[PDB]
Symmetry: C3
Subunit: 314 residues, 3 copies
């Protein structure tokens, strides 16, 4: 089965430059070559060139609305292109705002898709709830169907159409929620397993339930959106919004391991990896190895080990 | 419901000076104002002046017995006073030996109360079993009813009256216990979950069984004494007696979260946070930041998030 | 209940020097003295003088076959001697390749013994499957009954007799396995708990299932081989092949505590602790402290604490 790497060197999703350097870091560490070693076929799409919109005046509080809006539209145009030819889409980003390109492009070809959002935030505010005009923490808002019309239209997001409903997605690793956000998720009653939950049940029971909830009834493709800030700052320090007491290195692979196991992974997002934010070359090396590591896990590489079929090693 | 912050800048309890700075370290970090942000009312009682006793000769091994006694007596006098006006007490200490006063004053108004001791030690040595005349490691030996008269009367501790029995207390996070201490808890049969127990059951099940143990039969107030050294040093640096293999930030959080949920916490202790014992300013910020995290957990703040009632954020 | 420490300062098991200094590291940290504080009797059998074989040409890929084979032959003979007199055999190593002598000496006197292999690796390659001629990562290949005659006879290992079968052994914390290795364990179907396992069950249930799998039917002596690298480097950094995402200082103790709990320990190995590889004295002090923390545990020392029998501390 096909795999297509699509770099998204973008960052206007937030105030700290540097995340457009993620792709270049991930590829540098050896992601593309490490993947060709798996049972899959790998075609690297290269890095998309994001045209900058001049005079991108702020829509109320939101910053860079036409820029962010334009990039994502170019992303969702690319994604549909690989998913159309039946090939799994791995997007190497920038900030999370690129999810709107990532998941909108996915749904065009697999409208019945679900989403597992591994993040420490819901990154799902509305241009009416953000205390910051930053769109990297609003990706979901623009996606949700039940959120259509619950906030103004934002210059550059006309092309967007709510693709998934509050029933088809599940958060994992939440720990920093704004009053606003907590409201929405409760009100719309979305399924999540916040830090608290993943203390009480354990990452073992948590993927068991998230699977019966999303795949309990019908079998449908999986779109995994992984904010490196999902695991703790001791495993991913090179991120813009780090937050204490997160998901261990282990539960992370566990996650990515089980998702492989479903044979249902359709879209994968490796967002917000920032090489310039590492306090030491180590932490940058740390954040990337564990970013690559999770990316190889969603594609077979197990911790008990692997071996090539039909090969008698004796 | 009322909350009353009581400043206990005491340290005589032990040899390492620096703990009487705890309050000033927790207040500085924003504890007081952080709390008024919750659904509760907050009145800061201020820091109690502790009269020093001249010529506080040592009773055999014990050190500063009269000094440590009078303070506590003035602590139970302040506590009992605010609990009388139906308000929850949060004591920012010093060394733990002040618990003596926080639990003694508490029981005068709620004599049927229980105690969830989260710490790395049992601080239950008798003036006869301590290898150090230190009182921060004995607060319990004085409170226990089954321990009345199993050791000599210590000058300054005549006013004390064992308010609780070996039945109404459970320990959490035990890992450093002295031969004498383990004996006592085995003999009197106290309910505990030593780190070994938390690895076995999970911080999930553990809180499930400690609740049905202390609250399976009758519903009573919860006095929560928390020795910062309760968690591992990696999280709680700036503590006098740090001991490897401790309770994570997450577990110490899941505990406090659940103590809220009961709606039964009555008295709270935030003991042994030492500012001067931090190897770097970071480590002083850290322990503090997470001593605060917990204090704001005991009162609502959830990781999944919080939103104000009756407010429609849409 | 006899204990016999046996220093095996060997290292030819791999390319990095330093491991021979292990014993002389554990010993300084005060291992022997600390053990005498337990309920056991202690006899330190000094360190073994290992004669170096001149002109130890490489058998195909394998390196130091004759020097490694001779050393172990001399270890096994020391071992089988103190097990003979009814004493427990604790071996402070070098490189793990000395397991071969440690477990070989052990099966002579207790041919019905079991082994719990706590290590980040399976150390079970064959001279035909190694990518390196390193014997520290093959010990098991020489011990297995099912592996007899699955490779060529290696110079110096003519004295070795497969003593345990695929059935009496179990791994714990595997997270780095080469293609070959995985195959083997799969094919001979060995009972293990990779890191994924420990995540999904917990160090609680894990020991429950390893005990009922190894001791469910008959009660037999337990040989515990502990590759310090089985833990996470943050706990055991001073090691030759560290690997991210290991067991916690807490599971590590949990494990050694339950093994004490059976009353069946018989043989114990504390291999591959290398003092020269700690980036800082601290990492050397750390690692060491826990190759002992763990040992003094296999002999009782409980985190809940201990107290001497018949001694009324009141
Ligand atoms: Mn995000
Ligand atoms: Mn995030
Ligand atoms: Mn303590
Ligand atoms: Mn204490
Ligand atoms: Mn190993
Ligand atoms: Mn090994």
């Amino acid at each position: 089965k096909p795999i297509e790497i699509i770099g998204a060197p973008f960052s206007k999703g937030q105030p700290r430059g540097g995340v457009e350097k993620g792709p270049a870091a991930l590829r540098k560490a050896g992601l593309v070559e490490k993947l060709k070693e798996t049972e899959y076929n790998v075609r690297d799409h290269g890095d998309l060139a994001f045209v900058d919109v001049p005079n991108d005046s702020p829509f109320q509080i939101v910053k860079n609305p036409r820029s962010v809006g334009k990039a994502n539209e170019q992303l969702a145009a690319v994604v549909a292109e690989t998913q159309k030819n039946g090939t799994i889409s791995v997007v190497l980003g920038g900030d999370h705002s690129m999810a709107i390109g990532s998941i909108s492009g996915h749904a065009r070809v697999h409208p019945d898709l679900c989403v597992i959002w591994v993040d420490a935030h819901t990154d799902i505010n509305t241009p009416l709830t953000t205390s910051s005009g930053n769109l990297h923490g609003q990706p979901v808002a623009f996606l949700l169907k039940e959120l259509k019309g619950k906030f103004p239209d934002v210059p550059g997001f006309s092309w967007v159409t709510p693709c998934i409903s509050a029933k088809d997605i599940v958060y994992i690793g939440l720990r920093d929620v704004d009053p606003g956000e907590h409201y929405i998720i409760k009100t719309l009653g979305i399924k999540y397993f916040s830090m608290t939950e993943v203390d009480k049940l354990g990452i073992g029971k948590v993927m068991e339930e998230t699977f019966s909830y999303l795949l309990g009834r019908k079998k449908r493709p999986i779109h995994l959106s992984f904010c490196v800030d999902g695991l703790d700052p001791v495993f991913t320090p090179a991120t813009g919004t780090p937050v204490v007491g997160g998901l261990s290195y282990r539960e992370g692979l566990y996650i990515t391991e089980e998702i492989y196991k479903t044979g249902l992974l359709s879209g994968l997002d490796i967002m917000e990896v920032n090489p310039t934010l590492g306090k030491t070359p180590e932490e940058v090396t740390r954040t990337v190895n564990t970013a690559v590591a999770l990316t190889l896990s969603c594609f077979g590489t197990k911790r008990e080990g692997n071996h090539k079929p039909e090969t008698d090693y004796l």
